[PDB]
Design a protein around this ligand. Structure first.
Ligand SMILES: CN(CC[C@H](N)CC(=O)N[C@H]1C=C[C@H](n2ccc(N)nc2=O)O[C@@H]1C(=O)O)C(=N)N
Ligand SMILES: [Mg+2]
Ligand SMILES: [Mg+2]
Ligand SMILES: [Mg+2]
Ligand SMILES: [Mg+2]
Ligand SMILES: [Mg+2]
Ligand SMILES: [Mg+2]
Ligand SMILES: [Mg+2]
Ligand SMILES: [Mg+2]
Ligand SMILES: [Mg+2]
Ligand SMILES: [Mg+2]
Ligand SMILES: [Mg+2]
Ligand SMILES: [Mg+2]
Ligand SMILES: [Mg+2]
Ligand SMILES: [Mg+2]
Ligand SMILES: [Mg+2]
Ligand SMILES: [Mg+2]
Ligand SMILES: [Mg+2]
Ligand SMILES: [Mg+2]
Ligand SMILES: [Mg+2]
Ligand SMILES: [Mg+2]
Ligand SMILES: [Mg+2]
Ligand SMILES: [Mg+2]
Ligand SMILES: [Mg+2]
Ligand SMILES: [Mg+2]
Ligand SMILES: [Mg+2]
Ligand SMILES: [Mg+2]
Ligand SMILES: [Mg+2]
Ligand SMILES: [Mg+2]
Ligand SMILES: [Mg+2]
Ligand SMILES: [Mg+2]
Ligand SMILES: [Mg+2]
Ligand SMILES: [Mg+2]
Ligand SMILES: [Mg+2]
Ligand SMILES: [Mg+2]
Ligand SMILES: [Mg+2]
Ligand SMILES: [Mg+2]
Ligand SMILES: [Mg+2]
Ligand SMILES: [Mg+2]
Ligand SMILES: [Mg+2]
Ligand SMILES: [Mg+2]
Ligand SMILES: [Mg+2]
Ligand SMILES: [Mg+2]
Ligand SMILES: [Mg+2]
Ligand SMILES: [Mg+2]
Ligand SMILES: [Mg+2]
Ligand SMILES: [Mg+2]
Ligand SMILES: [Mg+2]
Ligand SMILES: [Mg+2]
Ligand SMILES: [Mg+2]
Ligand SMILES: [Mg+2]
Ligand SMILES: [Mg+2]
Ligand SMILES: [Mg+2]
Ligand SMILES: [Mg+2]
Ligand SMILES: [Mg+2]
Ligand SMILES: [Mg+2]
Ligand SMILES: [Mg+2]
Ligand SMILES: [Mg+2]
Ligand SMILES: [Mg+2]
Ligand SMILES: [Mg+2]
Ligand SMILES: [Mg+2]
Ligand SMILES: [Mg+2]
Lengths: 206, 210, 60
RNA sequence: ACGCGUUAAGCGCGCCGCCUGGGGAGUACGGCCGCAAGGCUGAAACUCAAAGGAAUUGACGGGGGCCCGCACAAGCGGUGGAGCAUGUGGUUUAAUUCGAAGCAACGCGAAGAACCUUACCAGGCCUUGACAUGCUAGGGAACCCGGGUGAAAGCCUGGGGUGCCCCGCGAGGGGAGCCCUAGCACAGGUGCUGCAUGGCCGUCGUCAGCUCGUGCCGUGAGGUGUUGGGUUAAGUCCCGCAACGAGCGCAACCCCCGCCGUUAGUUGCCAGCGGUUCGGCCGGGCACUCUAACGGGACUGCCCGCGAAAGCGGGAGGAAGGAGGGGACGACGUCUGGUCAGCAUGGCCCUUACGGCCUGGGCGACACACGUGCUACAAUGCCCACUACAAAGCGAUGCCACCCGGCAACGGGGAGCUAAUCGCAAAAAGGUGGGCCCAGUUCGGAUUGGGGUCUGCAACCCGACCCCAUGAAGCCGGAAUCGCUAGUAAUCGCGGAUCAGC
RNA sequence: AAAAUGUAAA
RNA sequence: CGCGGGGUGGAGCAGCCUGGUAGCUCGUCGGGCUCAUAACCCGAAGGUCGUCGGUUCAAAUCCGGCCCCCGCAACCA
């Protein structure tokens, strides 16, 4: 083990901060650990929707949470209920006046933190772990990527002495910082044990 | 009092006397085979191994020697010696033979031209020949009883397993199985020996009260 | 004593010395910053996901 | 299969000899031969689940060739000896919490153990609990309060706040957020298992490697490509080729450091000026240093020479030239690697207890041993004063120039600064006169004594500084071993992160 | 033209 | 009884005559080498010289007696 996170890598070379806001010295840690708890709530109630990215930004007290989903008919709720009651739960545990800012995915099979989550439950529900990859990339590549790679790790439906196997197709120049790529974990949580699905999509060296 | 400290590690073999009170009953249960499963020090890739050892604690043995024979049973015997000697040998009963009746040993001494010297030489050769002879009966029993006790072949030799990669010691004969271990492997032997002793005795009463 | 001590590092003390650091996110005690209220890893971890403001990998 | 191939192991035929799993065994027995040594003929019991033939892939070699690495050589400075620091083994003990183990454990997780941290220990306590969703409910009522015991935590204990839906002629309203009090789902675990795992790291190794696609060869495992000639730091190229291409790597794009300029012109800067009231303070100005964005700049681009090409070798000019120096960046893989103790996680366990709380001890123990390390043996040095020269950082919790107290740390008095403004602020070596004269010393600063400051609830265990007496071992370190190729080693200082304090 | 060894679990 | 021999750091040997003089080889413990062990290189540790009593100022040593070890005759016609 040695390969480093491709985000933290280009953290300021391509992909952006999930949190976009300035802070003072004795207040940073305060409106951080509070503000992180938001994605704790958001992931609790949007996996059912496709939570790939959050953009939590702040003014003076005034927050601006902007979410990125699959097909936001989920946050719609009963006409406009979940969009309401979430912003009604957003501010409700801060003290600060929030917002219902929400936006969606253009194409889903082109988002790593998404593409993974599909798989890590696809197999959390037993399914053929090999072909759940070779076709996963194949969906991504028939979704017009430039390259793809998928990784699972741990007891693959059996094998006590657990393994780490993968399949991939296309281009994946990680070491090149120029490349726009995409990475997102996903957690297979099966009866016999727990794995971990990584995913990488090379979208185009901007 | 005896030790073969073979390269690494150990002790290939060690003998030692333990002195004090109740030394017997508080270790008379250790005699037997001791299986051990861990990844040995002698190992070069993560493989567990089932080595073993043979504990053989034998009790104290007080020993004996009365200030020698009963001359009341003893049969002395003078007679003319056999061989070359002429007039002061064909005509002088210089040969001796002595016989210890309740044992059975017979020795004699046509060894020297005396008689008193052959007499005593018989009565001290027959010194050894009775006590130095019986010491075989001692060792024979010692040896044989240690052999049954200690148990020869290994790993299949029962009594107590010491499992390190799980930290669980189990005594087979009475079936404790606590996954404490190591504390005993530090020296705290009792969370173990006390169980067997009660268990040993539990059926002790079920013998002439059953 | 797990949870019973992150909850007792936050509770009001018996003195101004039984006061001490606790990683709010993980739960450390040693190597917990004041600047973040964080442990060396939780710091490390979230940082890679850009969820920590302005902090990029150093290089000089 | 290797190979054989009119000198068959090819296609045929005639005739002899010989084989029918390994070991036992070319033995034992019988016969025959022999001077002998032996020879010929030649079994079986028992035993095993194989023995073996070629060929492929790697690893390995006290095999070869070709390169490379502070690997050796060359050179400079260390450890190993002493005393102390801290870390580990051991031992130990009421426990001396757990884990890390050759490089790749040993100033490692610890970036702050007196309480805390704390898992260990002893003894006092806890039982739906220190924490989470809840349930039936004796009844409540935020709650400010307040008492006796005790080290505290806790067992007990006396006061009502009398508010809280919605209407009680009313004398009960009923509910209610939290709440007290029993009981049913309970939590709780630093308990085991990294040999059930995730994640992250370590390492060979920033090594130059690993492979895939089709084609082709081969009964096949597999080969070809990736081999070869040149080449480079490089599977880097260029040529060549039963190969043609492709991915992961190296380079490369990214960040500081060197050159140049556009821009910006204080809180920084100061060349010219009013100044002058002794002066970057006043006016003055962004010209220069400064700061910090946006940029150009080097491309074998130029020339003699060598090669077919890549490329090489020399100077030319330029801040810089064949990669200018530095960082980040760790390929398929390996090590049954490290980590269930940061955290998560399938199992297994514990359930007036492995859980939960406070008091005190311990994690700092010392018959011993190795790791990393500070400080030394001194004259290129040690001491007292004058005295210049840095740089990155830190703080309206606080940073504390200042007077005052002083032998001091400190103390009480506070002026500024939310910081290019004000502070930590003396950077030490260096410089300059004195000073010592070769000695267990004006070296060295261990050990211990008496007395003090500081922060904390409190420095016995067990703190860090200050002052006076004390002034040890050590006179250059056996065997062996270590770092390092240029602003590098060596040596001198300073700041920060964890942090009551250290 | 130097120098012995490495038991027993995939 | 009798002659003569040697007893000494754990094993095996000098040092006795000539009276003050603990030696060598292993072995041992503690440092290295090496992934590890031995080999190998570097330091240290270790015995009132059998035992009573003896003479000298003192006994490994000179000196008498049993205690050991060891060849050792004892011819007995
Ligand atoms: C016996 N001989 C020859 C010697 C005479 N002619 C014969 C004879 O018998 N002599 C022997 C006779 C007795 C002798 N004898 C034995 C015991 C004794 N106490 N005293 C003696 O003299 O020992 C003698 C000895 O050996 O010469 C040989 N062997 N030559
Ligand atoms: Mg897909
Ligand atoms: Mg043996
Ligand atoms: Mg006794
Ligand atoms: Mg005869
Ligand atoms: Mg005779
Ligand atoms: Mg017997
Ligand atoms: Mg284990
Ligand atoms: Mg069992
Ligand atoms: Mg506890
Ligand atoms: Mg021919
Ligand atoms: Mg033949
Ligand atoms: Mg035949
Ligand atoms: Mg056969
Ligand atoms: Mg044969
Ligand atoms: Mg026959
Ligand atoms: Mg003959
Ligand atoms: Mg081959
Ligand atoms: Mg050669
Ligand atoms: Mg060559
Ligand atoms: Mg050559
Ligand atoms: Mg070296
Ligand atoms: Mg020198
Ligand atoms: Mg553990
Ligand atoms: Mg430990
Ligand atoms: Mg309660
Ligand atoms: Mg009313
Ligand atoms: Mg009412
Ligand atoms: Mg009313
Ligand atoms: Mg296991
Ligand atoms: Mg390789
Ligand atoms: Mg080849
Ligand atoms: Mg070839
Ligand atoms: Mg070829
Ligand atoms: Mg080539
Ligand atoms: Mg190429
Ligand atoms: Mg002006
Ligand atoms: Mg000017
Ligand atoms: Mg100007
Ligand atoms: Mg360049
Ligand atoms: Mg060229
Ligand atoms: Mg040119
Ligand atoms: Mg030319
Ligand atoms: Mg040049
Ligand atoms: Mg958990
Ligand atoms: Mg208790
Ligand atoms: Mg506690
Ligand atoms: Mg000198
Ligand atoms: Mg002050
Ligand atoms: Mg500020
Ligand atoms: Mg001078
Ligand atoms: Mg002196
Ligand atoms: Mg003190
Ligand atoms: Mg030196
Ligand atoms: Mg400071
Ligand atoms: Mg030689
Ligand atoms: Mg030789
Ligand atoms: Mg002698
Ligand atoms: Mg001498
Ligand atoms: Mg080894
Ligand atoms: Mg030797
Ligand atoms: Mg004499």
């Amino acid at each position: 083990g040695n390969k480093i996170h491709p985000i933290g890598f280009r953290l300021g070379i391509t992909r952006d901060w999930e949190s976009r806001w300035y802070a003072g010295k004795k207040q940073y840690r305060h409106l951080l650990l509070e503000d992180q708890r938001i994605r704790g709530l958001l992931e609790k109630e949007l996996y059912s929707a496709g939570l790939a990215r959050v953009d939590i930004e702040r003014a003076a007290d005034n927050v601006a949470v902007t979410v990125h989903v699959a097909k936001p008919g989920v946050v719609i709720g009963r006409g406009g209920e979940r969009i309401r009651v979430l912003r009604e739960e957003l501010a409700k545990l801060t003290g600060k006046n929030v917002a219902l800012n929400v936006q969606e995915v253009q194409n889903p099979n082109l988002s790593a933190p998404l593409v993974a989550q599909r798989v890590a439950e696809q197999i959390e529900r037993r399914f053929a772990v090999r072909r759940a990859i070779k076709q996963a990339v194949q969906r991504v590549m028939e979704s017009g990527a430039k390259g793809a790679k998928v990784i699972v790790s741990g007891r693959i439906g059996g094998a006590e002495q657990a393994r780490t196997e993968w399949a991939a197709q296309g281009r994946v120049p990680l070491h090149t910082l120029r490349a726009n790529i995409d990475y997102g974990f996903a957690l297979a949580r099966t009866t016999y044990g727990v794995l971990g699905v990584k995913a990488y999509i090379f979208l185009g060296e901007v | 009092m005896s030790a073969s400290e073979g390269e690494h590690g150990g002790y290939k073999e060690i003998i030692a006397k333990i002195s004090g009170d109740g030394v017997y009953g508080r270790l008379k249960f250790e005699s037997g085979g001791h299986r051990v499963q861990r990844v040995p020090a002698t190992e070069s890739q993560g493989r567990i191994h089932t080595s073993a050892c043979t504990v053989a604690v034998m009790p104290e043995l007080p020993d004996a020697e009365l200030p020698d024979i009963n001359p009341a049973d003893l049969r002395i015997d003078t007679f003319r010696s056999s061989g070359a000697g002429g007039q002061h040998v064909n005509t002088t009963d210089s040969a001796i033979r002595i016989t210890h009746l309740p044992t059975g040993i017979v020795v004699e001494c046509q060894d020297e031209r005396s008689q008193h010297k052959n007499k005593a030489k018989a009565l001290s050769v027959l010194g050894a020949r009775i006590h130095a002879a019986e010491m075989a009966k001692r060792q024979q029993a010692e040896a044989s009883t240690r052999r049954n006790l200690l148990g020869s072949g290994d790993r299949s030799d029962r009594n107590r397993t010491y499992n390190f990669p799980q930290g669980r010691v189990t005594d087979h004969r009475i079936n404790l199985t606590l996954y404490r271990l190591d504390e005993v492997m530090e020296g705290k032997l009792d969370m173990l020996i006390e169980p067997i002793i009660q268990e040993h005795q539990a059926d002790q009463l079920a013998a002439l009260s059953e | 004593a797990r949870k019973a001590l992150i909850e007792k590092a936050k509770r009001t003390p018996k003195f101004k010395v039984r006061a001490y650091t606790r990683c709010v996110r993980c739960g450390r005690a040693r190597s917990v910053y004041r600047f973040f209220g964080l442990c060396r890893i939780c710091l490390r971890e979230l940082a890679h996901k850009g969820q920590l403001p302005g902090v990029r990998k150093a290089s000089w």
